[PDB]
CSV table of C-alpha atoms in Angstrom, one decimal:
chain,number,residue,atom,x,y,z
Y,1,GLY,CA,12.4,3.6,31.0
Y,2,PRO,CA,11.4,0.6,28.6
Y,3,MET,CA,7.7,1.2,27.7
Y,4,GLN,CA,5.0,-0.6,25.6
Y,5,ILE,CA,3.6,1.3,22.5
Y,6,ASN,CA,0.8,0.1,20.2
Y,7,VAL,CA,1.0,0.7,16.4
Y,8,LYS,CA,-2.5,0.1,14.8
Y,9,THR,CA,-3.4,-0.4,11.1
Y,10,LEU,CA,-6.5,1.0,9.3
Y,11,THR,CA,-8.0,-2.7,9.3
Y,12,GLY,CA,-7.9,-2.6,13.2
Y,13,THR,CA,-4.8,-4.8,13.6
Y,14,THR,CA,-2.5,-3.7,16.5
Y,15,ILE,CA,1.3,-4.4,16.9
Y,16,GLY,CA,2.6,-4.1,20.5
Y,17,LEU,CA,6.3,-3.0,20.7
Y,18,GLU,CA,8.7,-2.6,23.8
Y,19,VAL,CA,10.6,0.7,23.1
Y,20,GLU,CA,12.8,3.4,24.9
Y,21,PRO,CA,11.7,7.1,24.4
Y,22,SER,CA,15.3,7.7,23.0
Y,23,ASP,CA,14.5,5.2,20.1
Y,24,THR,CA,14.4,6.7,16.6
Y,25,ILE,CA,11.4,6.1,14.2
Y,26,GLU,CA,13.8,4.0,11.9
Y,27,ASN,CA,14.5,2.0,15.1
Y,28,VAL,CA,10.7,1.5,15.7
Y,29,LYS,CA,10.2,0.6,12.0
Y,30,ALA,CA,13.1,-2.0,12.4
Y,31,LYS,CA,11.2,-3.6,15.4
Y,32,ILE,CA,7.9,-3.7,13.3
Y,33,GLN,CA,10.0,-5.5,10.5
Y,34,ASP,CA,11.5,-8.1,12.9
Y,35,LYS,CA,7.9,-8.9,14.0
Y,36,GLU,CA,5.7,-8.8,10.8
Y,37,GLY,CA,8.4,-8.5,8.1
Y,38,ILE,CA,7.6,-5.1,6.5
Y,39,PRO,CA,10.8,-3.4,5.2
Y,40,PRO,CA,11.3,0.0,7.0
Y,41,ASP,CA,11.8,2.0,3.8
Y,42,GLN,CA,8.1,1.0,3.1
Y,43,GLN,CA,6.4,1.8,6.4
Y,44,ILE,CA,4.8,5.1,7.2
Y,45,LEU,CA,4.0,5.9,10.9
Y,46,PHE,CA,1.5,8.5,12.1
Y,47,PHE,CA,0.9,10.2,15.5
Y,48,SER,CA,-1.7,13.0,15.9
Y,49,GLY,CA,-2.1,13.4,12.1
Y,50,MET,CA,1.7,14.0,11.8
Y,51,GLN,CA,3.8,11.7,9.5
Y,52,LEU,CA,6.9,10.6,11.6
Y,53,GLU,CA,10.5,11.1,10.4
Y,54,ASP,CA,13.0,8.1,10.3
Y,55,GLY,CA,15.6,10.5,12.0
Y,56,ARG,CA,13.5,12.0,15.0
Y,57,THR,CA,12.8,10.1,18.3
Y,58,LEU,CA,9.6,9.1,20.2
Y,59,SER,CA,10.8,11.6,22.8
Y,60,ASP,CA,10.8,14.4,20.1
Y,61,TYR,CA,7.1,13.6,19.2
Y,62,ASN,CA,6.3,13.2,23.0
Y,63,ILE,CA,5.0,9.5,22.5
Y,64,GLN,CA,3.8,7.9,25.8
Y,65,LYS,CA,2.5,4.2,26.3
Y,66,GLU,CA,-1.2,5.4,25.8
Y,67,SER,CA,-0.3,7.0,22.4
Y,68,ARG,CA,-2.4,6.3,19.3
Y,69,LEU,CA,0.2,5.5,16.6
Y,70,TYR,CA,-0.9,4.4,13.0
Y,71,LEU,CA,0.9,2.2,10.4
Y,72,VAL,CA,0.4,2.3,6.6
Y,73,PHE,CA,2.5,0.1,4.2
Y,74,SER,CA,2.5,-1.2,0.6
Y,75,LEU,CA,0.3,-4.1,-0.6
Y,76,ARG,CA,3.6,-5.3,-2.4
P,10,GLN,CA,-31.6,30.8,49.6
P,11,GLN,CA,-31.5,29.7,45.9
P,12,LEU,CA,-27.7,29.0,46.0
P,13,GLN,CA,-28.4,25.2,45.9
P,14,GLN,CA,-30.5,25.6,42.7
P,15,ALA,CA,-27.5,27.4,41.0
P,16,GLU,CA,-25.0,24.7,42.5
P,17,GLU,CA,-27.3,21.9,41.2
P,18,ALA,CA,-27.7,23.6,37.8
P,19,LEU,CA,-23.8,24.0,37.7
P,20,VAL,CA,-23.7,20.1,38.3
P,21,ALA,CA,-26.3,19.5,35.5
P,22,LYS,CA,-24.2,21.6,33.1
P,23,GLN,CA,-21.0,19.7,33.8
P,24,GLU,CA,-23.0,16.4,33.1
P,25,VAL,CA,-23.5,17.9,29.6
P,26,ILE,CA,-19.8,19.1,29.1
P,27,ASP,CA,-18.6,15.5,30.1
P,28,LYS,CA,-21.0,13.9,27.5
P,29,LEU,CA,-19.7,16.5,24.8
P,30,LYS,CA,-16.0,16.1,25.8
P,31,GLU,CA,-16.5,12.3,25.5
P,32,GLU,CA,-18.2,12.7,22.0
P,33,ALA,CA,-15.3,15.1,21.0
P,34,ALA,CA,-12.7,12.5,22.2
P,35,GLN,CA,-14.3,9.8,19.8
P,36,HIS,CA,-14.5,12.5,17.0
P,37,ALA,CA,-10.8,13.3,17.5
P,38,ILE,CA,-9.8,9.5,17.1
P,39,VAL,CA,-11.6,9.3,13.7
P,40,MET,CA,-10.2,12.7,12.4
P,41,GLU,CA,-6.5,11.8,13.2
P,42,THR,CA,-6.9,8.7,10.8
P,43,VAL,CA,-7.8,11.1,7.9
P,44,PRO,CA,-4.1,11.8,7.0
P,45,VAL,CA,-3.5,8.0,7.5
P,46,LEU,CA,-6.3,7.2,5.0
P,47,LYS,CA,-4.9,9.8,2.5
P,48,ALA,CA,-1.4,8.1,2.8
P,49,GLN,CA,-3.0,4.6,2.5
P,50,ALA,CA,-4.8,5.8,-0.7
P,51,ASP,CA,-1.5,7.2,-2.2
P,52,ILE,CA,0.5,3.9,-1.5
P,53,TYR,CA,-2.3,1.6,-2.9
P,54,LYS,CA,-2.4,3.9,-6.0
P,55,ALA,CA,1.4,3.4,-6.5
P,56,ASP,CA,0.9,-0.4,-5.8
P,57,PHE,CA,-1.8,-0.6,-8.5
P,58,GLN,CA,0.2,1.3,-11.1
P,59,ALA,CA,3.4,-0.6,-10.4
P,60,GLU,CA,1.5,-3.9,-10.9
P,61,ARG,CA,-0.2,-2.8,-14.1
P,62,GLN,CA,3.4,-2.1,-15.4
P,63,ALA,CA,4.9,-5.5,-14.4
P,64,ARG,CA,1.8,-7.2,-15.9
P,65,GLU,CA,1.8,-5.1,-19.2
P,66,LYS,CA,5.5,-6.0,-19.7
P,67,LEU,CA,4.5,-9.7,-19.1
P,68,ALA,CA,1.6,-9.3,-21.6
P,69,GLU,CA,4.1,-8.0,-24.3
P,70,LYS,CA,6.5,-10.9,-23.8
P,71,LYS,CA,3.6,-13.4,-23.9
P,72,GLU,CA,2.5,-12.0,-27.4
P,73,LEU,CA,6.2,-11.9,-28.7
P,74,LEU,CA,6.3,-15.6,-27.6
P,75,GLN,CA,2.9,-16.4,-29.3
P,76,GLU,CA,4.1,-14.4,-32.5
P,77,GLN,CA,7.5,-16.3,-32.5
P,78,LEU,CA,5.5,-19.7,-32.1
P,79,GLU,CA,3.1,-19.1,-35.1
P,80,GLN,CA,6.0,-17.7,-37.4
P,81,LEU,CA,8.0,-21.0,-36.8
P,82,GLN,CA,4.8,-23.1,-37.4
P,83,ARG,CA,5.4,-21.8,-41.0
P,84,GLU,CA,7.8,-24.8,-41.5
F,11,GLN,CA,-21.0,34.8,47.3
F,12,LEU,CA,-23.9,33.7,44.9
F,13,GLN,CA,-22.6,35.8,41.9
F,14,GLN,CA,-19.4,33.5,41.8
F,15,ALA,CA,-21.9,30.6,41.0
F,16,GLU,CA,-23.8,32.8,38.4
F,17,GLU,CA,-20.4,33.7,36.7
F,18,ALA,CA,-19.4,30.0,36.7
F,19,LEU,CA,-22.7,29.0,35.2
F,20,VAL,CA,-21.8,31.4,32.3
F,21,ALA,CA,-18.2,29.9,32.1
F,22,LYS,CA,-19.8,26.4,31.7
F,23,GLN,CA,-22.3,27.8,29.1
F,24,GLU,CA,-19.5,29.1,26.7
F,25,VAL,CA,-17.6,25.8,27.3
F,26,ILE,CA,-20.8,24.0,26.0
F,27,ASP,CA,-21.3,26.5,23.1
F,28,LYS,CA,-17.5,26.2,22.0
F,29,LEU,CA,-17.8,22.3,22.1
F,30,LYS,CA,-20.9,22.4,19.8
F,31,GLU,CA,-19.1,24.9,17.5
F,32,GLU,CA,-16.1,22.6,16.9
F,33,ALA,CA,-18.4,19.4,16.8
F,34,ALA,CA,-20.2,20.9,13.7
F,35,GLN,CA,-16.9,22.1,12.1
F,36,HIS,CA,-15.4,18.5,12.2
F,37,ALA,CA,-18.4,16.5,11.1
F,38,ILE,CA,-17.3,18.1,7.7
F,39,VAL,CA,-13.8,16.3,7.8
F,40,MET,CA,-15.5,13.2,9.3
F,41,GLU,CA,-17.6,12.8,6.1
F,42,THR,CA,-14.4,12.4,4.0
F,43,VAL,CA,-13.5,9.2,6.0
F,44,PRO,CA,-16.0,7.0,4.0
F,45,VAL,CA,-14.7,8.7,0.7
F,46,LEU,CA,-11.1,8.0,1.6
F,47,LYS,CA,-11.9,4.3,2.6
F,48,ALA,CA,-13.7,3.7,-0.8
F,49,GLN,CA,-10.8,5.2,-2.8
F,50,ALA,CA,-8.3,2.9,-0.9
F,51,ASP,CA,-10.6,-0.1,-1.4
F,52,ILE,CA,-10.8,0.5,-5.2
F,53,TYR,CA,-6.9,0.8,-5.5
F,54,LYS,CA,-6.6,-2.3,-3.3
F,55,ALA,CA,-9.1,-4.4,-5.4
F,56,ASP,CA,-7.6,-3.0,-8.7
F,57,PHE,CA,-4.1,-4.0,-7.5
F,58,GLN,CA,-5.3,-7.6,-6.6
F,59,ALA,CA,-6.9,-7.8,-10.1
F,60,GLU,CA,-3.5,-6.8,-11.7
F,61,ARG,CA,-1.6,-9.3,-9.5
F,62,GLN,CA,-4.0,-12.2,-10.4
F,63,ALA,CA,-3.7,-11.1,-14.1
F,64,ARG,CA,0.2,-11.1,-13.9
F,65,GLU,CA,0.3,-14.6,-12.3
F,66,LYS,CA,-2.0,-15.9,-15.1
F,67,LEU,CA,0.3,-14.4,-17.8
F,68,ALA,CA,3.3,-15.9,-16.0
F,69,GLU,CA,1.7,-19.4,-16.3
F,70,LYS,CA,1.0,-18.9,-20.1
F,71,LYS,CA,4.4,-17.3,-20.7
F,72,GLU,CA,6.3,-20.4,-19.3
F,73,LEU,CA,3.8,-22.8,-21.0
F,74,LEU,CA,4.5,-21.1,-24.4
F,75,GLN,CA,8.3,-21.0,-23.8
F,76,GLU,CA,8.0,-24.9,-23.7
F,77,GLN,CA,6.0,-25.4,-26.9
F,78,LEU,CA,8.3,-23.0,-28.8
F,79,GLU,CA,11.4,-24.9,-27.4
F,80,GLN,CA,10.1,-28.4,-28.4
F,81,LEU,CA,8.8,-27.4,-31.9
F,82,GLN,CA,12.2,-25.6,-32.4
F,83,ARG,CA,14.1,-28.9,-31.6
F,84,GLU,CA,11.5,-30.9,-33.6
F,85,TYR,CA,12.2,-28.8,-36.8
J,1,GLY,CA,-33.0,26.0,-11.1
J,2,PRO,CA,-30.0,25.7,-13.6
J,3,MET,CA,-27.0,25.7,-11.1
J,4,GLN,CA,-23.2,25.0,-10.7
J,5,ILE,CA,-22.1,22.1,-8.4
J,6,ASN,CA,-18.4,21.2,-7.6
J,7,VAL,CA,-17.1,17.5,-7.3
J,8,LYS,CA,-13.8,17.1,-5.3
J,9,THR,CA,-11.5,14.2,-6.5
J,10,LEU,CA,-9.0,13.0,-3.9
J,11,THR,CA,-6.1,13.9,-6.3
J,12,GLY,CA,-7.2,17.6,-5.6
J,13,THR,CA,-9.1,18.3,-8.8
J,14,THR,CA,-12.5,20.1,-8.5
J,15,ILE,CA,-14.9,19.3,-11.5
J,16,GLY,CA,-17.4,22.1,-12.1
J,17,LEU,CA,-20.6,20.9,-13.7
J,18,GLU,CA,-23.7,22.9,-14.8
J,19,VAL,CA,-26.7,20.7,-13.7
J,20,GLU,CA,-30.4,20.9,-13.0
J,21,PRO,CA,-31.7,19.6,-9.6
J,22,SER,CA,-33.8,17.1,-11.7
J,23,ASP,CA,-30.5,15.7,-13.3
J,24,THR,CA,-30.2,12.0,-12.4
J,25,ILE,CA,-26.9,10.7,-10.9
J,26,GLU,CA,-26.0,8.7,-14.1
J,27,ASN,CA,-26.5,12.1,-15.9
J,28,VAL,CA,-23.9,13.9,-13.6
J,29,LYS,CA,-21.5,10.8,-14.1
J,30,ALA,CA,-22.0,11.2,-18.0
J,31,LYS,CA,-21.1,14.9,-17.7
J,32,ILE,CA,-18.0,13.9,-15.5
J,33,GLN,CA,-17.2,11.3,-18.3
J,34,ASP,CA,-17.3,14.1,-21.0
J,35,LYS,CA,-15.0,16.4,-18.9
J,36,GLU,CA,-12.6,13.8,-17.3
J,37,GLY,CA,-13.0,10.6,-19.5
J,38,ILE,CA,-13.9,8.4,-16.4
J,39,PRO,CA,-16.6,5.9,-17.5
J,40,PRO,CA,-19.8,6.3,-15.4
J,41,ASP,CA,-20.2,2.5,-14.3
J,42,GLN,CA,-16.7,3.2,-12.6
J,43,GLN,CA,-17.5,6.5,-10.7
J,44,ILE,CA,-18.7,6.7,-7.1
J,45,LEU,CA,-20.2,10.1,-6.0
J,46,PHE,CA,-20.4,10.9,-2.3
J,47,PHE,CA,-22.3,13.5,-0.3
J,48,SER,CA,-22.7,13.7,3.6
J,49,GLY,CA,-20.7,10.4,3.7
J,50,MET,CA,-23.2,8.3,1.6
J,51,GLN,CA,-22.9,6.9,-2.0
J,52,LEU,CA,-25.4,8.4,-4.5
J,53,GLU,CA,-27.6,5.9,-6.5
J,54,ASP,CA,-27.3,6.2,-10.3
J,55,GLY,CA,-31.2,6.2,-10.5
J,56,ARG,CA,-32.1,8.9,-7.8
J,57,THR,CA,-31.7,12.7,-8.6
J,58,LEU,CA,-29.6,15.5,-7.1
J,59,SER,CA,-32.9,17.0,-5.6
J,60,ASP,CA,-33.8,13.6,-3.9
J,61,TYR,CA,-30.5,14.2,-1.8
J,62,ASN,CA,-31.3,18.0,-1.4
J,63,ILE,CA,-28.0,18.8,-3.3
J,64,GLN,CA,-27.3,22.6,-3.6
J,65,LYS,CA,-24.6,24.7,-5.4
J,66,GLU,CA,-22.6,24.8,-2.0
J,67,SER,CA,-23.0,21.0,-1.2
J,68,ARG,CA,-19.6,19.3,-0.8
J,69,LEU,CA,-19.6,16.4,-3.4
J,70,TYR,CA,-16.6,13.9,-3.7
J,71,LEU,CA,-15.8,11.7,-6.7
J,72,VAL,CA,-13.9,8.4,-6.2
J,73,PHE,CA,-13.1,6.1,-9.2
J,74,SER,CA,-10.9,3.2,-10.6
J,75,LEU,CA,-7.9,3.7,-13.0
J,76,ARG,CA,-8.5,0.2,-14.6
């Protein structure tokens, strides 16, 4: 069912996203781009110290709404 | 007879476990950012180097121009 | 009846000991956080310095391209 | 007395320095400069999450052979 996740940056900024567990990481990175304009091929996402793969899904990493996700991206 | 001193000491012990679990929750939040900070450092490093290049190339062209300007002021 | 409470009070004790174990083992990795933050801050500040330096060389480049162009026409 | 300390860079490098507990932090940085060519005024040394002052000594921070020391620096 369509759930709300929260991708935080190291500066303490938080991006709320409405996602489906079946959604891929590329898919989530596409949402982040439509909102703050960061190209997906330049975002890195983290969950529980793991670097997330474009190809795998939120389901695969067992990401719930309460999940602590991190975003790193280039200064360029 | 002293079952309610053991029961009350069990309680007092859980009050400590809860405090530690709570401190270990907050520790865990910090520690999971460590790989994030490593990644942040690597990207910023590549950002810096990539910008030194673009600016070095632009520093060359600016001298070439300043050298081409002074050679043609021999006229 | 009472010995179940005495062998729970022990269960709680090694839950407290094991929490204090790990809490000392991860204050080690938690003291690389400030190190990682400073490294990222240096690369970020360095990058910004390179960007400002690039923009300044751009201004000069285009300013020289003019002078060169005019004094080429002029002569 | 005359001891070996190890300084961890974030690029993975461990810099081994022979030092005296009375060696000042600008002295360690000069040694690091001789081995790695990083100017001192551009090195930051860390221990127990705090930055080490150029003018205090290894012994003022109770720095032993086993003490975990990190070096962070600029490439400018």
